[PDB]
Each structure stands twice: as structure tokens, then as C-alpha cells.
Design a protein around this ligand. Structure first.
Ligand SMILES: N[C@@H](Cc1c[nH]c2ccccc12)C(=O)O
Ligand SMILES: N[C@@H](Cc1c[nH]c2ccccc12)C(=O)O
Lengths: 373, 373
RNA sequence: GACCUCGUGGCGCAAUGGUAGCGCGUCUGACUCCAGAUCAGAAGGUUGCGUGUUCGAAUCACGUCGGGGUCACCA
RNA sequence: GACCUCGUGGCGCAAUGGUAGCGCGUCUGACUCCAGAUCAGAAGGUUGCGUGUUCGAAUCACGUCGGGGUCACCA
């Protein structure tokens, strides 16, 4: 697989150890999410400060985002939201969700309308995760920028403090890139500062922000944490997640363009079954006999990784890990287990997504005061 | 002085000749402004198309701007506004005025509040020029960006179509510059496209824009005219003005930082007199005798240039030019003439500026439908 | 996060025993119808801060703030 | 505005008489508990457009659209 620990050291973040997980527990009076228990969210930045502040009755809000690449969203896009939804319940803090429709516009061969529409469409799947209408504000960059008295002002503050060389270094842009991409980083940094949401944080500028996200988003936030001090703001705390494995393997890349690259949120029970059996990479031995003797390799087995993300029952997961690893369970039954887990899951999502009306999306996307300001 | 014709050829613009001036006359049933008659506004881009459209009952709006460097504005900052105010009367079109408070923020050692305040303050002097409350919208970038459904969208369209190398070339930025300056050009291009003012141009995207401005602003608009086609919009037409001379000479640079660099809009009758006599560069001969024989040089004489901008009476101006040039009038009386012209002028401005209430500024700066949409 | 580099008289820049210079400026007097050139002089908060090392420090160390640059192509 | 450069099979790239290649992919069959490696083959809108120059053109000229680059430091 990939060296997450070496990644941690490389970037400079911190490993989420037991003391931290226990702290989260002690701080929420609730069992830490399996993503934490199982290592899915393994890295962090300043989480203890978040915890210290929280335990000391000081506010903090969650900030996470989504790049509306298309109307197609797969099971892997949900991880950070599934986690953030949990975080919101467990800490009871307000949440801000950024739809970078303007980023996709700058990057994909998309039109502002398509981009925006994708933002709005994805918002349905995000909302379907169960976020609290009263304490979460989903917003598209294209919309919010033009209707906020604090957001642009921060983008500008942030931009006066980030040179091209910096982004060139952090993101690897080039003089050949459009000035849109060159400065986009500030747009993603901006929601890390509460006064970008005047209508919800009462012009306050010191509310602690916690950004749960996939490890590959860290560069934006390392840059953010870097300008924050320079512009009189606190730096956002982070909770990093690992990469969701593509069906072809942890190494390989997945995308809404290749349908057999992952289980998409629209897939049917049948497609769920087909995709796993016909595409989930395996760690199981070639012949059913070699497997029995050597046991399967759960480290590279995409189906087990999947279960690791969605089989909530700790004990059940272990049975599988144990029997698969020993050879007692052939990768065929493993994949069979993953399908009985995914089918009811994707179904449920499609269900609650449908219950998301236009007025509900409209609300979520409307800037307003939020329950716990 | 400076080679404006060579500038015209360099840039690629067009010289405003008699046929054009006469066209403007024939098109407005009114005598073309002295800035046109005397060469102050000497260059243009597509003015005939503006005229063709206008004469053919097709709409066009004016767009001009101001960089709120400070609360201090001198007589030279007024030229493009004095002209634009005339253009508005004479063509009866709506006008849009951009206060680039975010540009000064990025460039000067200013704070967002100072920047914004300067924008609002300058708006008073601009408004004092007599623009029509019903057909002109003065706006600060810092404000409008956060309260417009079309402006940011265009900045983004414009940014996806302008590479760093381009601006590097056009403005000479460097990898060392902040991403804020790198992409600022799009912000100044954006008001060249009517749909940036949805609340006034009814989401229309083909209304002809005419940008009166100082020749040194052309680079922004050459870049604009360049992306316009690529993003399905018409390119802005231009009317270029020459540089207002600094008191130390046409060559030398002037700035709100050096008070004796020009006559400021707040100056007193006495200061007007003092500054001219004690600082206006001259083209008059050394000794009062050499002057009589050789006559003065009106080409480099800052005081005459001044009269050229503010002595509206064509005949009177000629008398001065004639007598000064022959030696009949010593530069002392010339400067005396310029002072009797400037004093009542600056006074009048200070007068009508005072009549500009906060509610009047507030109105001008409020995005709304405009008389002639 | 780490490291590197710079941080000056109003701005742009200079490694002690004589006169620490003005690119550029400001200011006063003279000459000129005026402005400028010129000539004659005058003035301006010196070292980002905080400790410390030496007989002495802007020139050294530590810490700190700020500008800039830099770290397994890429979000 | 001018000039330069590129523009391909789903993407990344190649200057005719034999077999226009696959970096990479897609797809079918076989073998495997499944996925992958492997083996065996199948398919995909070829030249951004529009004219034109030659017996023939993706390889030339003109025009055009689009990506990129470039022109008296600087708005
Ligand atoms: N760029 C992210 C979107 C995003 C914007 N802001 C964020 C903050 C946290 C995590 C992700 C985001 C994506 O492509 O999905
Ligand atoms: N940059 C210009 C301000 C400006 C913005 N948009 C404009 C359009 C036309 C002329 C000037 C402007 C200045 O410094 O004064």
C-alpha cells in the first residue's frame, strides 16, 4: 500500500494515536467513530487544541468541502462527509460545506452552469448523509462569493499574503497556468476563517475551525495555516483521512469518468454485485487451494478495505479479517459479505437522497444564522 | 513631451481625428468637449462602432474607474471623470464607476477598511462632478463582489482565460508577486461586461461598453478585448486620455503623497496661488527680456497645459497661447491667468462636494435598476 | 513545519582610528518676470524587536516579528 | 493588434510503395474460488474547420476557430 506514516512525517502533521482517540471519547461521551478506531482518519493538525477549547466551552466549527466534478458521486466521496456528519452530531457544532464549482470550472472542461448544477446536485447526496438543516450551511463558491460581505474580503486578505512562488511550490502551478488556478487556493482557504460567514459567526474572527478532509487536501491547508497568523486569524485544525481505494487497487486512481472505478451512489443492487465480483481487486490467492494454505492478503484486498470503511460491527469485521487472512474464508465469500453490506447501504442513501426536495437544498444553501452560532 | 502618436502606434489603438470628433458631434447634436477638441482624449478603440450602434438605437454604457490610493485627490484625477460626466450627458447612457479599493489594498500598505473608506471618500469627489444619480452606479470592488450575482462569475470566466504569462507580459508581474496582484486584472476587466451588473442590465450580455480612461490603463483593456471574444462577449471600446502633467513637468511623476506635485481638490485659493507660482514648471524664458524676444515655450509649460485642460473658452485660450508664445505675455501673467481659472474651479468643486450627503453616496453605491437600463 | 536570506536616515543602497555617500528627495539664501539649471549651505528618530557574547557591535549567538526564497510534478 | 507554435484513434504521442505503434485504455475467450499477472484475439468517427495548390496530402498556401508562447520593467 502507501506509507501514511511516512506521509505524516513528510507533511509535518501528527498521527492520531490512542490517547487522542480516547480524548475524543472523553470529550464527547460517545464511542469514537470507526474511521478513527480503524485508522481511516489517521492524521491531524492541532486536534488537541480543538479538544482543549471544546472541553473549555469555547466554540469551534467544522469546515469540509466537495469539488463538483460531475453529477456522479461514488462511495469514496462520502467518507469525509460520513465522518463530518458524525463529528457534527458528536460535538454538536455548526458546519460549513464548500462546493468548489468555480474550481471545477477552472479545472475541468465545464461551463459555469454545469459546474453550478453539479454543485447543487452533489449537495443532495451530501445532505442525504444526514447533516442538520439547522447547523450546516452548504454553499457553492459561485453563489456565495456574490452574496457575502466577508468571504471575498478574506480571499483578498489571503491573496495578498500568498505569492505565486508559494503556490508554484505547494501546488506546482506554472507561468502557463491561468491566473484563475493560480489564485484559487485562497478561495479554499477562506472558509477556514469564521468571518467569511458574517451571517453565521457574527463578524467574529477567532472561532476555531476544524477541517476534516482527505490527506491530499492538506497542501491547501498547510498554505492556510501559514497565512492565518499573518492576517490575524487562528489556523485551522485538521483531521486527515486516507485515500479510498479504487476497485482496481489502492495504488490505482479512480474517477467519476470510469464507472467500474468504484461503487457509485446511483448504482443498483445488481451493479453493486457485478462491480465487486468483476472488479474489486483481491488479496486472495490464485487457486482456492493456495488460499486455504497461505490465507489471503487483507492489506491489498480492495473488498476488505471496503468492509473496513463500511462494516460498522467491529467484531464481525474481525471474523472476516481472521478467516480471510487464515484462508478459512475464500475471497469469493468475502466479496459476498461486502455486497450484503454495500447493497442495503447504497440503497438507503438513494432513499434518503430522494427525500431531499428542492426547497430543502435551497434552504441548506441559503446563508443564514445557524442554531449554534 | 511624450510621443502620444508613437504610443498610439505602439499599443495599436487609433488616433482621434476630425472626422471622429465631427461624428461625435453629428451623433450628439452637441459641441464636442474641449478634451476632444484640444487633444486631451486623443486615442480610441472602436469608437466608430460605438457611434454606429448608438446612431442605430442600440444601447451602450460607460465604464470608468478610480483607484482609491488615498483620501487625497488632485485636479488630475478628475479629467477622466469630467470627461465621462460630459459623455453621460451628451449620450445619455448609464454609467458604471469602479472603485478598486481591493487593488489598492493589494498594492499599497493599506488595510481593507482604509481602502474601502478611501473608495467611499473618493466617491464624494467623483459624485461632485455631477453624475446623474439615476444613471450612474459607483461601486467598490470590496462591496460589490460580495453582493452581485454576475460580477464574480465574470471575473472567474476572465481568469480561466488569462494565463500568468499573459499578465506577466502585459503588466510585468513576477513569480514573486502575490496571487492577488496576478489575478487582479480580471477584476478590472469584469465591469466591461454588462452581465456583471445583472441588477441593471437585466442579465444581458451584449450591451456595448465604452471605457473612457487614461492611456496607461489600456493594458488592462487590451487584455480584456482579448478574452472578450473567447468568452462570448463583445470587447470594450476605449477613449484614451493623455497624462495630466505634474507641476514639476510632463515628464515627472505626481502622487497624492507629495502635496506640491499637483493642485489637490481640497487646496485653498491661497494654496492654489502658491503652488502654481512656486511649483508650476515653466516654458517661459529665463530673463523677462529673453522671453520678450524668443517668446515662451507652451509645449513644456505646465501652466499652459493646465489652462489647456480647464480654460473652456477656446478663444481666450488662444489669446494666451498666442501672447505667451510670442513673448507678449510673461509666464508670470500666464500663471496669474491659470490661478483665476483654478481658484473658482476648485472652490466650486469643494462646494458641490459638500452637498454630497452620506445618503447620496449610499444611494450611488447601491446596486439597483438604472433609469436608462 | 524545517531551512535559507534580507529587514537603513522620507524612499534606494554602503563591513569603525580622517570627511557613515548620496541613486532620489526635502529645506533655506542667491540669481530669474515664475518654475527649472546652477551656486551656497541647513535639517531629518540611529540599530524591526527582546535577551545575551566582547574592551566595542548594525556587522556574532539565541529567541521573536515581517518581506522574500526553498523542500519525493502533484491535489 | 502583430508574429510564432500546436491542434490524433477514449486520452498521450509518431513525415505514405510491406505490418499508421501503442506510453495508457477499452472489449471478448481461456485459466483462477474472485480480482490481478499471463495467453489468445475483437472493436473504436480518420484530417479543428473552410477554400485552395498537386498526379497524391494530416505533412503546402490563404482564411478561420481554439490551446500555448512572444513584443521600449511598467500602470
Ligand atoms: N478541492 C476539494 C473541495 C474542497 C473545498 N474546500 C474543502 C475543504 C476540505 C476538504 C475538501 C474541500 C475537492 O476537490 O473535493
Ligand atoms: N486602476 C485604475 C482604476 C480603474 C478600475 N477600473 C477602471 C476602468 C477605467 C479607468 C480606470 C479604472 C486607477 O488606479 O485609477
Amino acid at each position: 500500500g502507501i506509507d501514511y506514516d511516512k506521509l505524516i512525517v513528510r507533511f509535518g502533521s501528527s498521527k492520531i494515536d490512542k490517547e487522542l482517540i480516547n480524548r475524543i471519547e472523553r470529550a464527547t461521551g460517545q464511542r469514537p467513530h470507526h474511521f478513527l478506531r480503524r485508522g481511516i482518519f489517521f492524521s491531524h493538525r492541532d486536534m488537541n487544541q480543538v479538544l482543549d477549547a471544546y472541553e473549555n466551552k469555547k466554540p469551534f466549527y467544522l469546515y469540509t468541502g466537495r469539488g463538483p466534478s460531475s453529477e456522479a458521486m461514488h462511495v469514496g466521496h462520502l467518507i469525509p462527509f460520513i465522518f463530518t456528519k458524525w463529528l457534527q452530531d458528536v460535538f454538536n457544532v455548526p458546519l460549513v460545506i464548500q462546493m468548489t464549482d468555480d474550481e471545477k470550472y477552472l479545472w475541468k472542461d465545464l461551463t459555469l452552469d454545469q459546474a453550478y448544477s453539479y454543485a447543487v446536485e452533489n449537495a443532495k447526496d451530501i445532505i442525504a448523509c444526514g447533516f442538520d438543516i439547522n447547523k450546516t450551511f452548504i454553499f457553492s463558491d459561485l453563489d456565495y462569493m456574490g452574496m457575502s460581505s466577508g468571504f471575498y474580503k478574506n480571499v483578498v486578505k489571503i491573496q495578498k499574503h500568498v505569492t505565486f512562488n508559494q503556490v508554484k511550490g505547494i501546488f506546482g502551478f506554472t507561468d502557463s497556468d491561468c491566473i484563475g488556478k493560480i489564485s484559487f487556493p485562497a478561495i479554499q482557504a477562506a472558509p477556514s476563517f469564521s468571518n467569511s460567514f458574517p451571517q453565521i459567526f457574527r463578524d467574529r474572527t477567532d472561532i476555531q475551525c476544524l477541517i476534516p478532509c482527505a490527506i491530499d487536501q492538506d497542501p491547501y491547508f498547510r498554505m492556510t495555516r501559514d497565512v492565518a497568523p499573518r492576517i490575524g486569524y487562528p489556523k485551522p485544525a485538521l483531521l486527515h483521512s486516507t485515500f479510498f481505494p479504487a476497485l482496481q487497487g489502492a495504488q490505482t486512481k479512480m474517477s467519476a469518468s470510469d464507472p467500474n472505478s468504484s461503487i457509485f451512489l446511483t448504482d443498483t443492487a445488481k451493479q453493486i454485485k457485478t462491480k465487486v465480483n468483476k472488479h474489486a481487486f483481491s488479496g486472495g490467492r490464485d487457486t482456492i487451494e493456495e488460499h486455504r494454505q497461505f490465507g489471503g492478503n487483507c492489506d491489498v484486498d480492495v473488498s476488505f478495505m471496503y468492509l473496513t470503511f463500511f462494516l460498522e460491527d467491529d467484531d464481525k469485521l474481525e471474523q472476516i479479517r481472521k478467516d480471510y487472512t487464515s484462508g478459512a474464508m475464500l475471497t469469493g465469500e468475502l466479496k459476498k459479505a461486502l455486497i450484503e453490506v454495500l447493497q442495503p447501504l447504497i440503497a438507503e442513501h438513494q432513499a434518503r437522497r430522494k427525500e431531499v426536495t428542492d426547497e430543502i437544498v435551497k434552504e441548506f444553501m441559503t446563508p443564514r444564522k445557524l442554531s449554534f452560532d
